[PDB]
């Protein structure tokens, strides 16, 4: 394999595009220099070897080589879902809905084999050539159920505007509804083209305005009542009152045929 261009850097390293010379196959390569991490990078591989789904970025292999680690990962040639949300516009409601469905199938599968991605946001929803959505990056993901026994979480991980309010208050919390919340901030982004708030916290006027049901404001006013009816159920402060993926699957707007 040989490295063509540089797809998305940041911290852990870079995903670079790599095309093989002879075979006519291109598939991305995360590059991690452990000088910082060795016990973390083996957790992402652990968790990647578990995964196999049409809505999750496939894993292929890895080669440790000195301080360097290479994670060979399915190439998603449609880029990020971040780059298809237009500022203060968002996207066509029928495209929003199609992506939510494929997003609920990826997380329904994760949750079923006891993984939680923990940092779901548009940057981490890649897309293939036929524009099917894939869940990407499991280096913050973790095992919230093993041998049919659930472990509540307590560590603060994620990105502040997608994170669930209980992750800043409660000292321990279930992993599933934190993924359900993130997926609802992603639904507001796809239909509103802005993120509602910095963080779901209490000295934050925007979140306090949502809890007061001031939907006559941004971003909620750019969203139609059907899919705003559903967001009302996902972005609930109390995790045990919050909706679940089987009850999203029966939502009016989730099963509404959109043009
Ligand atoms: C950050 C990241 C991880 C990744 N894993 N697998 C992939 O395809 N990517 C990425 C692919 C792109 C991309 C960029 C331009 N055109 C198509 C795809 C960008 C970032 C990533």
Q: Do 224 and 168 belong together in one domain?
A: yes
Residue 107 to residue 101: CA distance in whole angstroms: 10
Residues 167, 128 share a domain: yes
Q: In terms of Cα–Cα distance, which of 219, 224, 220, 215 is closest to 256? A: 224
Angstrom distance (rounded) from CA 251 to CA 230: 7
- CA gap 190, 154 in Å, rounded: 29
Q: What one-character-per-residue DSSP string does 49-84 give?
A: HH---TTB--EEEEEEETTEEEEEE---TT-BSGGG
Whether 101 and 73 share a structural domain: no
> For ligand 1, what atom is nearest to the CA of residue 78?
17
Report yes or no: 164 and 177 within 8 Å, Cβ to Cβ.
yes
CA neighbours closer than 13 Å in the CB half-sphere of residue 130: 4
Q: Of all protein residues, whose CA lies closest to atom 10 belonging to ligand 1? A: 7
Contact residues for 175 (Cβ-Cβ < 8 A; gap 6+) = 116, 118, 142, 144, 152, 153
User: CA–CA separation, 162 vs 164, rounded Å?
Assistant: 7
How far does residue 130's CA lie from ligand 1's centre (Å)? 15
Q: Is the CB of 73 under 6 A from ligand 1?
A: yes
Cβ density class 133-154: b for 16+ within 10 Å, e for less: bbbbbbbbbbebbeeeeeeebe
Domain count, the chain: 2
- List, in order, residues 6 or more apart from 75 with CB less than 8 Å away: 17, 26, 27, 28
71 and 125 in a single domain? The answer is no
Coil, strand or helix at 85: coil
The answer for residues whose C-beta is within 8 angstroms of residue 21's C-beta and 6 or more apart is 1, 2
The parent domain of residue 92 ranges over: 87-259
Which CATH number is 97's domain given? 1.10.510.10
Is the minimum distance from the CB of 135 to ligand 1 under 6 angstroms? no
Please tell me the distance from the alpha carbon of residue 254 to that of residue 152, in angstroms, as a whole number.
29
Residues 229 and 112 in one domain: yes
Instruction: Return the half-sphere exposure (C-beta side, CA atoms, 13 A cut-off) of residue 225.
Output: 0
- Residues 177 and 251 placed together within one structural domain of the fold: yes
């Amino acid at each position: 394999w040989d490295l063509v261009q540089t797809l998305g850097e940041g911290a852990y390293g870079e995903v670079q595009l790599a095309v093989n010379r002879v075979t006519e196959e291109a598939v991305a390569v995360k590059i991690v220099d452990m000088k910082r991490c060795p016990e973390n990078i083996k957790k992402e591989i652990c968790i990647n070897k578990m995964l196999n789904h049409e809505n999750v970025v496939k894993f292929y292999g890895h080669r440790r080589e000195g301080n360097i680690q290479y994670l060979f990962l399915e190439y998603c040639s449609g880029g990020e879902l971040f780059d298809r949300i237009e500022p203060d516009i968002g996207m066509p409601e029928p495209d929003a809905q199609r992506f939510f469905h494929q997003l609920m199938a990826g997380v329904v599968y994760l949750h079923g084999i006891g993984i939680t991605h923990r940092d779901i946001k548009p940057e981490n929803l890649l897309l293939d050539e036929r524009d099917n959505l894939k869940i990407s990056d499991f280096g913050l993901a973790t095992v919230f159920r093993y041998n049919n026994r659930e472990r509540l979480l307590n560590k603060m991980c994620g990105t502040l505007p997608y994170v669930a309010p209980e992750l800043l208050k409660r000292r321990e919390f279930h992993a599933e509804p934190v993924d359900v919340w993130s997926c609802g901030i992603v639904l507001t982004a796809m239909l509103a083209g802005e993120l509602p708030w910095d963080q779901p916290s209490d000295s934050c006027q925007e979140y306090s305005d949502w809890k007061e049901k001031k939907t006559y404001l941004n971003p909620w006013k750019k969203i139609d009542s059907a899919p705003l009816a559903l967001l009302h159920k996902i972005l609930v402060e109390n995790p045990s009152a919050r909706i679940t993926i089987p009850d999203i699957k029966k939502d009016r707007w989730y099963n509404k045929p959109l043009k």
